[PDB]
Amino acid sequence: GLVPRGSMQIFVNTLTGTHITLEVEPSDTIENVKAKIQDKEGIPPDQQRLIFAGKQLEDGRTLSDYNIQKESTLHLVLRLR
Amino acid sequence: AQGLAGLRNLGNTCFMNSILQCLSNTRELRDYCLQRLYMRDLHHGSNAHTALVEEFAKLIQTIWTSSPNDVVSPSEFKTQIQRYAPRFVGYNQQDAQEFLRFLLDGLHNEVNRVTLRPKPENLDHLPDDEKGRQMWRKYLEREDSRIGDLFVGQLKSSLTCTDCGYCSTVFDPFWDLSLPIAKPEVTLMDCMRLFTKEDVLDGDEKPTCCRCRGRKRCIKKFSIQRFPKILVLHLKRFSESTSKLTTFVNFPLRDLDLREFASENHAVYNLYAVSNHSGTTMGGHYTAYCRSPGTGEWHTFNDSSVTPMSSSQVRTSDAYLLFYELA
Ligand SMILES: [Cl-]
Ligand SMILES: [Cl-]
Ligand SMILES: [Zn+2]
């Protein structure tokens, strides 16, 4: 008996260009998504930026807000400052 | 000599000046501003919290009416960008690609030809190219501007199940490509080959096959379904530990030929601007090297200081964003 996997899967293109697969729901927020990337990659949420269709995904919004569907890829980048 | 104005640093705003000069030397975007063609695409007037396109176009106009070594203040423009995107309030350094993404987002929303966006469907009966076309049409129902006319392409991602052999395809719009640092003597073509390589998703990354109904090893690969007129390549200079990856990536100034990455069989580009980051991951400094659209000579734009340079000095390990235009 396990908690179920997310109903939809999306990919994240990581810093080395290999993909990770995330178990998610349409209702998941970008913060939830960043927490999943933290679990897989060990990168602090506060350093992550996620790009999809030219938009940088903002905390407080959901996957559904950006009409991100099954098997789309989010592009993970950090910052040079 | 034209368009050779400096931009005053306002307090850790080199990231903003670098991108602004790269945009200033984006010939068709520059022209859209100088010809005031945006005034046809704005749907109503601005107020003090919404004049992003107005202030951006006026900065561009000012740069293109300056005498060489004039220094222009972008303080008005900064006020508008931080109103649209409040992460830019104040005087901390920021990332040039993050700024690029927000700035083009605000510019595009304000000149979007789509004034009331529409609110998904099964396209399995279609061949891939026609499914791509339909997805492009759908995207254009929501996002259709002069800014997107220039930077937007479409990536195809093919995900094949190693068990039942079903290949699921999805088409994602893009406004830039963030590319991994590949490999010694790394080329930009190596980085694009790594980006688009067959990537085997196994172990904790096995996707769930939508036909086998369980977790399966799949192969995921990108190709480019539609090439944008202006192709912005963002190099992921972020190593695993976090800190800046300083690898020298050898990119060409002309004849970047991306036909190998096309989904089908006009994918030749010439460089015209580079955003450079020098220094540590925090506390670094941005500059831009830009080819003037009129003379084809390169200049270094370093906040207030605009100096000439040889094309041979353009390629350096500090390059971070590459701005390519179709040949
Ligand atoms: Cl955010
Ligand atoms: Cl190359
Ligand atoms: Zn399968």
Short mmCIF file of C-alpha atoms and ligand atoms in Angstrom, two decimals:
data_model
loop_
_atom_site.label_atom_id
_atom_site.label_comp_id
_atom_site.label_asym_id
_atom_site.label_seq_id
_atom_site.Cartn_x
_atom_site.Cartn_y
_atom_site.Cartn_z
CA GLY A 1 0.00 0.00 0.00
CA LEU A 2 1.62 3.26 -1.21
CA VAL A 3 0.30 6.83 -1.76
CA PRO A 4 -0.65 7.03 -5.45
CA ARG A 5 1.66 8.49 -8.12
CA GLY A 6 0.55 11.76 -9.75
CA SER A 7 -2.09 11.41 -12.47
CA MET A 8 0.08 13.18 -15.02
CA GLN A 9 3.76 13.14 -15.76
CA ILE A 10 5.94 15.97 -16.90
CA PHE A 11 9.71 16.24 -17.45
CA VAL A 12 12.28 18.64 -16.27
CA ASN A 13 15.41 19.27 -18.29
CA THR A 14 18.12 19.44 -15.63
CA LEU A 15 21.34 21.37 -15.43
CA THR A 16 23.28 18.67 -17.48
CA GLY A 17 20.50 18.34 -20.10
CA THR A 18 19.23 14.94 -18.90
CA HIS A 19 15.56 14.70 -17.95
CA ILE A 20 13.85 13.78 -14.75
CA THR A 21 10.23 12.61 -14.69
CA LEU A 22 7.82 14.18 -12.16
CA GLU A 23 4.58 12.79 -10.91
CA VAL A 24 2.19 15.73 -10.69
CA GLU A 25 -1.38 16.98 -10.84
CA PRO A 26 -2.76 19.96 -12.77
CA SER A 27 -3.46 21.56 -9.41
CA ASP A 28 0.14 21.34 -8.17
CA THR A 29 1.76 24.73 -7.57
CA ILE A 30 5.11 25.76 -8.90
CA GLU A 31 6.43 25.54 -5.29
CA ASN A 32 5.34 21.89 -5.15
CA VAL A 33 7.11 21.34 -8.49
CA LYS A 34 10.29 23.01 -7.17
CA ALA A 35 10.08 20.73 -4.07
CA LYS A 36 9.99 17.69 -6.36
CA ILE A 37 13.04 18.98 -8.22
CA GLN A 38 14.76 19.51 -4.90
CA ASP A 39 14.06 15.76 -4.09
CA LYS A 40 15.56 14.55 -7.35
CA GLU A 41 18.41 17.05 -7.98
CA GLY A 42 19.32 18.44 -4.52
CA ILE A 43 18.90 22.07 -5.71
CA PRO A 44 17.29 24.47 -3.24
CA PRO A 45 13.89 25.73 -4.42
CA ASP A 46 15.07 29.33 -3.90
CA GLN A 47 17.76 28.89 -6.58
CA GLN A 48 15.52 27.14 -9.18
CA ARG A 49 13.89 28.86 -12.20
CA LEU A 50 11.63 26.90 -14.50
CA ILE A 51 10.99 27.96 -18.08
CA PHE A 52 8.04 26.70 -20.21
CA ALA A 53 6.78 28.30 -23.46
CA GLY A 54 9.00 31.34 -22.70
CA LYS A 55 7.39 31.90 -19.31
CA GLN A 56 9.29 31.72 -16.09
CA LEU A 57 6.86 29.82 -13.80
CA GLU A 58 5.96 31.76 -10.68
CA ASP A 59 5.30 30.54 -7.16
CA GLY A 60 1.61 30.68 -6.23
CA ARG A 61 0.47 29.54 -9.68
CA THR A 62 -0.44 26.01 -10.66
CA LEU A 63 0.56 23.83 -13.66
CA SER A 64 -2.99 24.30 -14.86
CA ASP A 65 -2.53 28.09 -14.86
CA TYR A 66 0.13 27.72 -17.53
CA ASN A 67 -1.80 25.03 -19.46
CA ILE A 68 1.11 22.65 -18.96
CA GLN A 69 -0.02 19.24 -20.16
CA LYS A 70 1.20 15.65 -20.13
CA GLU A 71 4.79 15.08 -21.18
CA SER A 72 5.66 18.76 -21.56
CA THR A 73 9.16 19.72 -20.48
CA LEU A 74 10.07 22.43 -17.99
CA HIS A 75 13.56 23.86 -18.44
CA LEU A 76 15.50 24.19 -15.19
CA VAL A 77 18.10 27.01 -14.97
CA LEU A 78 19.72 28.79 -11.98
CA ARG A 79 21.19 32.35 -11.88
CA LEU A 80 24.35 34.23 -12.62
CA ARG A 81 24.41 37.36 -10.53
CA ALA B 1 28.03 56.04 -36.19
CA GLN B 2 24.64 54.90 -34.96
CA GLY B 3 23.24 53.22 -31.87
CA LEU B 4 26.52 53.44 -29.97
CA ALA B 5 25.06 54.93 -26.73
CA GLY B 6 26.08 53.79 -23.25
CA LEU B 7 23.60 52.97 -20.49
CA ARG B 8 24.18 54.23 -16.97
CA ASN B 9 24.42 51.58 -14.30
CA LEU B 10 21.74 52.38 -11.70
CA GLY B 11 23.05 50.15 -8.98
CA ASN B 12 23.76 46.48 -9.91
CA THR B 13 21.83 46.96 -13.25
CA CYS B 14 24.50 45.72 -15.62
CA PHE B 15 22.31 42.68 -16.26
CA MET B 16 19.59 45.02 -17.51
CA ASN B 17 21.96 47.13 -19.73
CA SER B 18 23.47 43.95 -21.32
CA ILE B 19 20.08 42.64 -22.36
CA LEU B 20 18.84 46.07 -23.44
CA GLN B 21 21.81 46.44 -25.84
CA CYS B 22 21.26 42.94 -27.17
CA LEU B 23 17.65 43.95 -27.81
CA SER B 24 18.65 47.35 -29.24
CA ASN B 25 20.74 45.52 -31.86
CA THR B 26 17.95 43.05 -32.68
CA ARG B 27 17.28 44.68 -35.99
CA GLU B 28 13.56 43.98 -36.50
CA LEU B 29 12.71 44.62 -32.83
CA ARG B 30 14.69 47.92 -32.94
CA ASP B 31 12.78 48.83 -36.16
CA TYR B 32 9.39 48.00 -34.60
CA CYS B 33 10.35 50.62 -31.94
CA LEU B 34 11.85 53.32 -34.23
CA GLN B 35 8.93 53.08 -36.71
CA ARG B 36 6.53 53.23 -33.71
CA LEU B 37 4.71 50.19 -35.09
CA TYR B 38 3.85 49.14 -31.47
CA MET B 39 1.30 52.07 -31.36
CA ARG B 40 -0.84 50.14 -33.80
CA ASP B 41 -0.69 46.99 -31.61
CA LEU B 42 -1.41 48.53 -28.18
CA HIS B 43 -5.10 48.19 -27.46
CA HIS B 44 -5.53 51.20 -25.16
CA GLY B 45 -3.45 53.80 -23.34
CA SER B 46 -1.08 53.12 -20.48
CA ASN B 47 -0.94 54.63 -17.01
CA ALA B 48 2.10 54.99 -14.71
CA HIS B 49 2.06 51.26 -13.78
CA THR B 50 1.66 49.84 -17.29
CA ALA B 51 3.80 51.81 -19.80
CA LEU B 52 6.43 49.01 -20.33
CA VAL B 53 6.28 48.98 -24.18
CA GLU B 54 6.15 52.81 -24.23
CA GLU B 55 9.27 53.22 -22.06
CA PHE B 56 11.15 50.34 -23.71
CA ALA B 57 10.46 51.87 -27.23
CA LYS B 58 11.48 55.33 -26.04
CA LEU B 59 14.83 53.97 -24.66
CA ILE B 60 15.43 52.30 -28.01
CA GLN B 61 14.58 55.52 -29.85
CA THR B 62 16.94 57.45 -27.60
CA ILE B 63 19.80 54.98 -28.14
CA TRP B 64 19.28 55.18 -31.99
CA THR B 65 19.24 59.01 -32.01
CA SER B 66 22.35 59.44 -29.82
CA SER B 67 25.86 60.58 -30.88
CA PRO B 68 28.64 58.06 -30.16
CA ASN B 69 29.68 58.01 -26.45
CA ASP B 70 26.42 59.65 -25.30
CA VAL B 71 25.35 57.88 -22.01
CA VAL B 72 21.55 57.28 -21.72
CA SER B 73 19.73 56.73 -18.41
CA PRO B 74 17.26 53.77 -18.42
CA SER B 75 15.80 54.77 -15.04
CA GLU B 76 12.32 55.34 -16.45
CA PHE B 77 12.36 51.97 -18.21
CA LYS B 78 13.53 50.27 -14.94
CA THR B 79 10.56 51.78 -13.11
CA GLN B 80 8.19 50.14 -15.64
CA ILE B 81 9.88 46.70 -15.74
CA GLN B 82 9.86 46.46 -11.85
CA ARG B 83 6.18 47.45 -11.83
CA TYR B 84 5.42 44.59 -14.22
CA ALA B 85 7.77 42.21 -12.50
CA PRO B 86 8.45 43.20 -8.87
CA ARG B 87 11.43 40.95 -8.43
CA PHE B 88 13.32 43.78 -10.18
CA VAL B 89 12.49 46.41 -7.51
CA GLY B 90 15.59 47.82 -5.93
CA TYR B 91 19.26 47.38 -6.65
CA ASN B 92 20.34 43.73 -6.26
CA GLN B 93 22.14 41.94 -9.15
CA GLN B 94 19.93 39.73 -11.19
CA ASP B 95 20.22 37.15 -13.83
CA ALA B 96 20.16 38.42 -17.47
CA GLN B 97 18.12 35.48 -18.81
CA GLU B 98 15.57 35.84 -16.03
CA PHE B 99 15.28 39.55 -16.93
CA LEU B 100 15.01 38.69 -20.66
CA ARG B 101 12.15 36.28 -19.95
CA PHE B 102 10.16 38.76 -17.88
CA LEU B 103 10.79 41.72 -20.17
CA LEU B 104 9.74 39.87 -23.34
CA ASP B 105 6.73 38.45 -21.51
CA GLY B 106 5.54 41.98 -20.55
CA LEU B 107 6.26 43.41 -24.02
CA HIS B 108 4.41 40.54 -25.68
CA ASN B 109 1.39 40.73 -23.39
CA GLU B 110 1.02 44.42 -24.04
CA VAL B 111 1.15 44.07 -27.89
CA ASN B 112 -0.63 40.70 -28.08
CA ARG B 113 -2.97 40.71 -31.11
CA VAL B 114 -5.17 38.29 -29.13
CA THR B 115 -7.30 40.56 -26.90
CA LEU B 116 -9.53 37.94 -25.24
CA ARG B 117 -7.72 34.57 -24.94
CA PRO B 118 -9.77 31.28 -25.57
CA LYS B 119 -10.16 28.81 -22.61
CA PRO B 120 -7.31 20.35 -25.30
CA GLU B 121 -8.08 17.45 -27.71
CA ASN B 122 -7.04 14.05 -29.10
CA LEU B 123 -4.86 14.41 -32.21
CA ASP B 124 -3.71 10.79 -32.55
CA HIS B 125 -5.32 10.49 -35.97
CA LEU B 126 -2.96 13.12 -37.32
CA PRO B 127 0.53 12.62 -38.77
CA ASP B 128 3.22 14.33 -36.60
CA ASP B 129 3.75 17.40 -38.81
CA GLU B 130 0.07 18.10 -39.00
CA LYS B 131 -0.33 17.61 -35.21
CA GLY B 132 2.51 20.17 -34.82
CA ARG B 133 0.70 22.62 -37.12
CA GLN B 134 -2.52 22.23 -35.14
CA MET B 135 -0.70 22.77 -31.86
CA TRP B 136 0.97 25.87 -33.32
CA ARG B 137 -2.43 27.18 -34.44
CA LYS B 138 -3.78 26.58 -30.93
CA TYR B 139 -0.85 28.44 -29.34
CA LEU B 140 -1.35 31.38 -31.75
CA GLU B 141 -5.04 31.59 -30.63
CA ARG B 142 -3.70 32.75 -27.25
CA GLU B 143 -0.30 34.29 -28.07
CA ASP B 144 0.19 36.22 -31.25
CA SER B 145 2.39 39.33 -31.38
CA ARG B 146 5.23 41.05 -33.22
CA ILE B 147 7.50 40.05 -30.39
CA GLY B 148 6.50 36.36 -30.74
CA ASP B 149 6.87 36.75 -34.55
CA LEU B 150 10.55 37.14 -33.84
CA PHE B 151 11.53 34.83 -30.92
CA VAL B 152 9.03 31.94 -30.88
CA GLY B 153 9.73 28.44 -32.21
CA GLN B 154 8.34 25.02 -31.47
CA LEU B 155 10.20 22.01 -29.99
CA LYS B 156 8.93 18.45 -30.64
CA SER B 157 9.53 15.96 -27.86
CA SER B 158 9.21 12.25 -28.81
CA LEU B 159 8.80 9.83 -25.96
CA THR B 160 9.06 6.18 -27.01
CA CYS B 161 8.17 3.23 -24.78
CA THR B 162 10.91 0.55 -25.03
CA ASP B 163 8.26 -2.09 -24.36
CA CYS B 164 5.24 -1.50 -26.68
CA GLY B 165 7.16 0.86 -29.04
CA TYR B 166 4.51 3.62 -28.82
CA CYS B 167 6.03 7.09 -29.48
CA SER B 168 4.02 9.90 -27.85
CA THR B 169 4.81 13.30 -29.33
CA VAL B 170 4.18 16.71 -27.75
CA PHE B 171 5.00 20.12 -29.23
CA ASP B 172 6.06 22.88 -26.76
CA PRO B 173 6.49 26.53 -27.88
CA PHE B 174 9.80 28.11 -26.90
CA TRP B 175 11.17 31.65 -26.84
CA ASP B 176 14.78 30.62 -26.17
CA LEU B 177 16.66 27.38 -25.63
CA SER B 178 18.66 26.74 -22.47
CA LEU B 179 21.42 24.36 -23.56
CA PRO B 180 23.58 22.05 -21.48
CA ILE B 181 27.35 22.40 -21.42
CA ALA B 182 28.47 19.19 -23.26
CA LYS B 183 31.66 17.06 -22.99
CA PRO B 184 38.25 19.25 -23.75
CA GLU B 185 37.23 21.53 -26.86
CA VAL B 186 33.42 22.02 -26.51
CA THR B 187 31.50 23.52 -29.44
CA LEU B 188 28.06 24.97 -29.49
CA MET B 189 27.05 22.18 -31.89
CA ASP B 190 28.12 19.64 -29.15
CA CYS B 191 25.83 21.45 -26.71
CA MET B 192 22.89 21.36 -29.15
CA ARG B 193 23.61 17.66 -29.85
CA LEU B 194 23.47 16.97 -26.08
CA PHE B 195 20.23 18.97 -25.79
CA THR B 196 18.56 16.93 -28.57
CA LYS B 197 20.19 13.51 -27.83
CA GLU B 198 18.06 10.37 -27.14
CA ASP B 199 17.78 10.45 -23.36
CA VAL B 200 17.04 7.10 -21.70
CA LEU B 201 14.65 7.51 -18.83
CA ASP B 202 15.06 4.61 -16.45
CA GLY B 203 15.23 3.79 -12.72
CA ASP B 204 13.47 6.48 -10.64
CA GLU B 205 12.92 8.42 -13.94
CA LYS B 206 10.88 5.64 -15.74
CA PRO B 207 7.77 7.37 -17.07
CA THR B 208 4.37 5.60 -16.99
CA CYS B 209 3.55 4.32 -20.49
CA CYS B 210 0.02 5.42 -21.47
CA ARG B 211 -0.43 2.02 -23.29
CA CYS B 212 1.37 -0.52 -21.05
CA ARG B 213 -0.25 1.20 -18.05
CA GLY B 214 2.90 0.76 -15.86
CA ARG B 215 6.38 2.36 -15.36
CA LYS B 216 8.62 1.60 -18.37
CA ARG B 217 12.12 2.62 -19.62
CA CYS B 218 11.44 5.22 -22.32
CA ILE B 219 13.62 7.18 -24.72
CA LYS B 220 12.86 10.95 -24.86
CA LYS B 221 14.34 13.09 -27.71
CA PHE B 222 13.94 16.64 -28.85
CA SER B 223 13.92 18.07 -32.35
CA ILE B 224 13.00 21.54 -33.64
CA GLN B 225 9.62 21.66 -35.35
CA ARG B 226 9.71 25.44 -36.07
CA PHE B 227 12.80 27.62 -36.03
CA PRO B 228 12.36 31.17 -34.74
CA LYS B 229 13.63 34.21 -36.72
CA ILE B 230 15.70 35.21 -33.67
CA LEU B 231 17.17 32.27 -31.77
CA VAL B 232 18.33 32.96 -28.25
CA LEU B 233 20.64 30.33 -26.80
CA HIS B 234 21.10 30.36 -23.06
CA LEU B 235 24.12 28.29 -21.83
CA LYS B 236 23.45 26.48 -18.48
CA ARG B 237 26.70 27.62 -16.78
CA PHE B 238 25.59 25.97 -13.48
CA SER B 239 27.68 23.06 -12.14
CA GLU B 240 26.57 20.22 -9.82
CA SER B 241 27.70 21.07 -6.28
CA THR B 242 26.04 25.41 -6.63
CA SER B 243 28.55 27.39 -8.69
CA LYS B 244 29.33 28.78 -12.16
CA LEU B 245 30.52 26.48 -14.92
CA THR B 246 33.13 28.44 -16.81
CA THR B 247 33.74 26.16 -19.76
CA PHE B 248 34.84 27.71 -23.02
CA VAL B 249 32.06 26.95 -25.52
CA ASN B 250 33.16 27.55 -29.10
CA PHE B 251 30.20 29.16 -30.91
CA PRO B 252 30.40 30.39 -34.57
CA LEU B 253 29.78 34.03 -35.51
CA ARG B 254 28.22 32.98 -38.83
CA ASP B 255 26.75 29.83 -40.33
CA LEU B 256 25.36 28.10 -37.29
CA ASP B 257 23.65 25.37 -39.25
CA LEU B 258 20.90 23.63 -37.24
CA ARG B 259 19.38 21.62 -40.03
CA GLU B 260 20.49 18.33 -38.30
CA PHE B 261 18.10 19.12 -35.39
CA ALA B 262 15.09 19.89 -37.52
CA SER B 263 12.08 17.60 -37.16
CA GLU B 264 11.72 17.63 -40.97
CA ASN B 265 14.56 17.86 -43.55
CA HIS B 266 16.11 27.47 -43.28
CA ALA B 267 17.89 26.70 -40.05
CA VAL B 268 21.13 28.68 -40.75
CA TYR B 269 21.90 31.53 -38.32
CA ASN B 270 24.37 34.36 -37.90
CA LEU B 271 25.33 35.76 -34.47
CA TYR B 272 24.57 39.40 -33.70
CA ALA B 273 24.81 39.78 -29.88
CA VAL B 274 26.24 38.16 -26.81
CA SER B 275 25.40 38.77 -23.18
CA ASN B 276 28.61 38.02 -21.12
CA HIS B 277 28.77 37.31 -17.34
CA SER B 278 32.19 37.65 -15.74
CA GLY B 279 33.06 36.69 -12.20
CA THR B 280 31.68 34.63 -9.42
CA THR B 281 28.20 33.10 -9.41
CA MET B 282 27.25 36.07 -7.09
CA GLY B 283 29.03 39.43 -7.43
CA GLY B 284 29.74 39.15 -11.12
CA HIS B 285 29.40 41.68 -13.88
CA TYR B 286 27.51 41.75 -17.20
CA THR B 287 28.60 43.26 -20.56
CA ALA B 288 27.32 42.80 -24.17
CA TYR B 289 29.12 42.40 -27.46
CA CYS B 290 26.81 43.54 -30.28
CA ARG B 291 27.07 43.71 -34.07
CA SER B 292 25.59 46.90 -35.36
CA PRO B 293 22.77 46.06 -37.90
CA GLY B 294 23.96 48.84 -40.25
CA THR B 295 27.74 48.52 -40.26
CA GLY B 296 28.36 44.91 -39.20
CA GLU B 297 31.11 46.08 -36.87
CA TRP B 298 31.17 44.77 -33.26
CA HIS B 299 31.25 46.95 -30.16
CA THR B 300 31.58 46.13 -26.47
CA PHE B 301 28.86 47.74 -24.40
CA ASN B 302 29.85 47.90 -20.80
CA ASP B 303 27.31 50.08 -18.95
CA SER B 304 28.37 53.65 -19.88
CA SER B 305 31.36 52.65 -22.00
CA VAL B 306 30.91 51.63 -25.72
CA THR B 307 34.15 50.64 -27.43
CA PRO B 308 35.06 49.06 -30.72
CA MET B 309 36.26 45.46 -30.90
CA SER B 310 37.32 43.03 -33.51
CA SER B 311 35.00 40.16 -34.37
CA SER B 312 37.91 37.91 -33.22
CA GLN B 313 37.35 39.10 -29.64
CA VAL B 314 33.60 38.13 -29.54
CA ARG B 315 34.02 34.48 -28.57
CA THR B 316 35.01 34.10 -24.92
CA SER B 317 34.27 31.78 -22.01
CA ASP B 318 32.04 34.49 -20.41
CA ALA B 319 29.39 34.25 -23.14
CA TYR B 320 26.07 33.36 -21.44
CA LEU B 321 23.34 34.31 -23.89
CA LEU B 322 23.84 34.05 -27.62
CA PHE B 323 21.53 36.01 -29.95
CA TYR B 324 21.31 34.45 -33.45
CA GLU B 325 19.32 35.76 -36.43
CA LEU B 326 18.23 33.58 -39.41
CA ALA B 327 20.72 34.14 -42.34
CL CL C 1 8.72 32.71 -8.20
CL CL C 2 29.68 25.05 -33.24
ZN ZN C 3 4.39 0.98 -23.57
#
